[PDB]
Structure 1
Amino acid sequence: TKGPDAASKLPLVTPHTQCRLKLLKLERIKDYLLMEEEFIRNQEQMKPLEEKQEEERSKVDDLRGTPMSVGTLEEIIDDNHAIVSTSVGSEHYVSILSFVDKDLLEPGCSVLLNHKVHAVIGVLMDDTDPLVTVMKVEKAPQETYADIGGLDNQIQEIKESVELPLTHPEYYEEMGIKPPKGVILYGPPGTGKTLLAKAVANQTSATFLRVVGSELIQKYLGDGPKLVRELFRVAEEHAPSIVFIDEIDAIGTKRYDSNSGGEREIQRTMLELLNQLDGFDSRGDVKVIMATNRIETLDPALIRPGRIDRKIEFPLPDEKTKKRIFQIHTSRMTLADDVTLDDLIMAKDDLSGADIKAICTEAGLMALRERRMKVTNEDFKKSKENVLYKTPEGLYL
């Protein structure tokens, strides 16, 4: 098979005070990018290589004709005829021409067919419809485990699930435990589930596929399951890979007897997702990560030990994790010496990582209100109740 993807540039992020160590490293990166540009522009400047076979390729192209429609090879027959489905959904019993790679023909791979008198004239290993191409991550997110505060147990678990099998896995089969096929992160909103997925996609060595869950559902009949199948086929093809499906409850709700056609199609799409999850062996190097807020509303078959063994909990940050997050998000701020930040943490509340980030942003805004950028402690004091909107007083004492 082919190899993974998601190329990223240098981490940099060693200096941040803009002390020309940043400038020197960035100038080195820019110099290398310049040599990229110049080298390829020179290579295209002189590169005469074409024709050669020509005639045989010309006549095979004439045989193929123009245009050529792509379909899905649903089934094969004796090695001259096959069953191919056009993107509309109609499949036909067609013939297979000699110049096709009989080894490449398998149920599922896209086949180039003749526009008139349909007949398999080619195989496309890179169909990758625009949607599933979009779901594949190209530029790694700039966030990383340095940006994540706390969640040390969560980071440990996610790395033990998706990284350790990717890196040296000998511990797994040495203990004989099958690697955890699939992991579901869950917790209250803005705890860091999507942030952890970003950090995983940063420090990665596999094709990362970001999905929205609600993205899978498609209007046309059978488009949903077909897209799910395409996504997982791309995952296997570019294995090792990580398939992140954020907001799994967009489809993961409890399965109930469908009545309307649309609900039947949703049930079909989830059934196909579950079937694809079961399809690949856990020994395979393709893992899935599903994040959600309403874990209690998920179907209790998606989270079966035979399908998703692990269940990572993302609890609201503790006081030490709260101060860790505050330190992280205040790194780029020019805080004064009067600020302590301890009063905000000590206040018994339900701050989250998102809440703390917003508190820092609003403190910066309040400082900008006073025409300053040093950000006093009073700025944080105001910002805390500015962003934290909304037990009867002395009932409990």
Structure 2
Amino acid sequence: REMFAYAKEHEPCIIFMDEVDAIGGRRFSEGTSADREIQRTLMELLTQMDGFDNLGQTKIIMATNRPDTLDPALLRPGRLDRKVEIPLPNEAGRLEIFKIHTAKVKKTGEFDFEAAVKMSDGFNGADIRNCATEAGFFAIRDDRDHINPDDLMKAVRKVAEVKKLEGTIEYQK
């Protein structure tokens, strides 16, 4: 309640809810008392989001890792007006991510990514930066200080391998 207040004296505020699944829960309360604790805190939000209290320069950015956990009154538009999905990086969307992360590292000189990455799919954007980290271990093994395309081509095999350990399946609206 008092955080929204802060938002009305501070200019154009932006409220990032990070990784909310805690009070994302549904009506439950046939389980433990924790589920009514969720409930109490949830009702609080609705009255703020829409009512005589109306926003305009207070914005909600809500970050979650799965949206079908939530209660549907937290899927309610005009509180959530745009529902932006960011998918997994694409065939050449990995390429675009790679060119910013090869500037950070020391490299022989590598502009030969393109084929290998598209056909080593299975990466999210944070795993591209794990190809660079794991390629810096193959480098350390050789006693190199540079990322080679010899180091890189062993790295994409490894990094893909360790993610097949468990799957992930998610569907969306």
TM-score range, shorter chain: 0.7 to 0.9
1:197-233, CA deviations, whole angstroms, 9 ceiling, x for partnerless residues? xxxxxxxxxxxxxxxxxxxxxxxxxxxxxxxx12222
After superposition, the Cα gap between the structure-2 partners of 1:346 and 1:236, relative to the gap in structure 1 and judged at 3 Å, is same
Q: Which amino acid counterpart does residue 331 of structure 1 have in structure 2? A: A
Q: Which amino acid counterpart does residue 305 of structure 1 have in structure 2? A: P
CA–CA distance in 1 between the matches of 2:25 and 2:36? 14
1:113-132, CA deviations, whole angstroms, 9 ceiling, x for partnerless residues? xxxxxxxxxxxxxxxxxxxx
Q: What TM-score, normalized to structure 2?
A: 0.83
- Pairing 1:357–2:129 present: yes
Work out whether residues 7 and 13 of structure 2, in 8 Å CA contact, stay in contact via their aligned partners in 1.
yes
CA–CA distance in 2 between the matches of 1:305 and 1:314? 19
Give the counterpart of 1:255 among 27, 52, 59: 27
Alignment partner, residue 47 of structure 2: 275
SS of the residue 2:50 aligns to: helix
Work out whether residues 245 and 290 of structure 1, in 8 Å CA contact, stay in contact via their aligned partners in 2.
yes
1:348, CA displacement in angstroms? Answer: 5.0
Listed as ranges, the matches of 1:132-143 within 5 Å are none
1:376, CA displacement in angstroms? Answer: 1.1
1:327, CA displacement in angstroms? Answer: 0.5
After superposition, the Cα gap between the structure-2 partners of 1:258 and 1:235, relative to the gap in structure 1 and judged at 3 Å, is farther
Unaligned 5+ segments in structure 1 are: 1-228, 391-397
CA–CA distance in 1 between the matches of 2:67 and 2:99? 30
Higher percent of residues as helix = 2
Alignment partner, residue 244 of structure 1: 16
- Pairing 1:367–2:139 present: yes
CA–CA distance in 2 between the matches of 1:338 and 1:313? 32
Alignment partner, residue 84 of structure 2: 312
Q: Which amino acid counterpart does residue 155 of structure 2 have in structure 1? A: S
Work out whether residues 258 and 267 of structure 1, in 8 Å CA contact, stay in contact via their aligned partners in 2.
no
CA–CA distance in 2 between the matches of 1:324 and 1:351? 13
Q: What TM-score, normalized to structure 1?
A: 0.38
Q: Which amino acid counterpart does residue 277 of structure 1 have in structure 2? A: M
CA–CA distance in 1 between the matches of 2:156 and 2:15? 37
Listed as ranges, the matches of 1:13-162 within 5 Å are none
CA–CA distance in 1 between the matches of 2:60 and 2:93? 27
CA–CA distance in 2 between the matches of 1:292 and 1:308? 13
CA–CA distance in 2 between the matches of 1:243 and 1:338? 40
Work out whether residues 120 and 157 of structure 2, in 8 Å CA contact, stay in contact via their aligned partners in 1.
no
Work out whether residues 339 and 377 of structure 1, in 8 Å CA contact, stay in contact via their aligned partners in 2.
no
After superposition, the Cα gap between the structure-2 partners of 1:369 and 1:259, relative to the gap in structure 1 and judged at 3 Å, is closer
CA–CA distance in 2 between the matches of 1:354 and 1:340? 20
Give the % identical residues.
47
After superposition, the Cα gap between the structure-2 partners of 1:332 and 1:260, relative to the gap in structure 1 and judged at 3 Å, is closer
1:148-179, CA deviations, whole angstroms, 9 ceiling, x for partnerless residues? xxxxxxxxxxxxxxxxxxxxxxxxxxxxxxxx
Higher percent of residues as strand = 1
1:243, CA displacement in angstroms? Answer: 0.4
Work out whether residues 244 and 290 of structure 1, in 8 Å CA contact, stay in contact via their aligned partners in 2.
yes
1:357, CA displacement in angstroms? Answer: 0.8
1:258, CA displacement in angstroms? Answer: 5.0
Alignment partner, residue 72 of structure 2: 300
Unaligned 5+ segments in structure 2 are: 165-173
After superposition, the Cα gap between the structure-2 partners of 1:375 and 1:306, relative to the gap in structure 1 and judged at 3 Å, is closer
What is the root-mean-square deviation of aligned Cα atoms in Å? 1.9
Work out whether residues 95 and 117 of structure 2, in 8 Å CA contact, stay in contact via their aligned partners in 1.
yes
1:259, CA displacement in angstroms? Answer: 4.9
Q: Which amino acid counterpart does residue 7 of structure 2 have in structure 1? A: A
1:347, CA displacement in angstroms? Answer: 0.8
Alignment partner, residue 331 of structure 1: 103
* Structure of larger gyration radius: 1
The alignment of Structure 1 onto Structure 2 pairs a total of residues equal to 161
SS of the residue 1:289 aligns to: strand
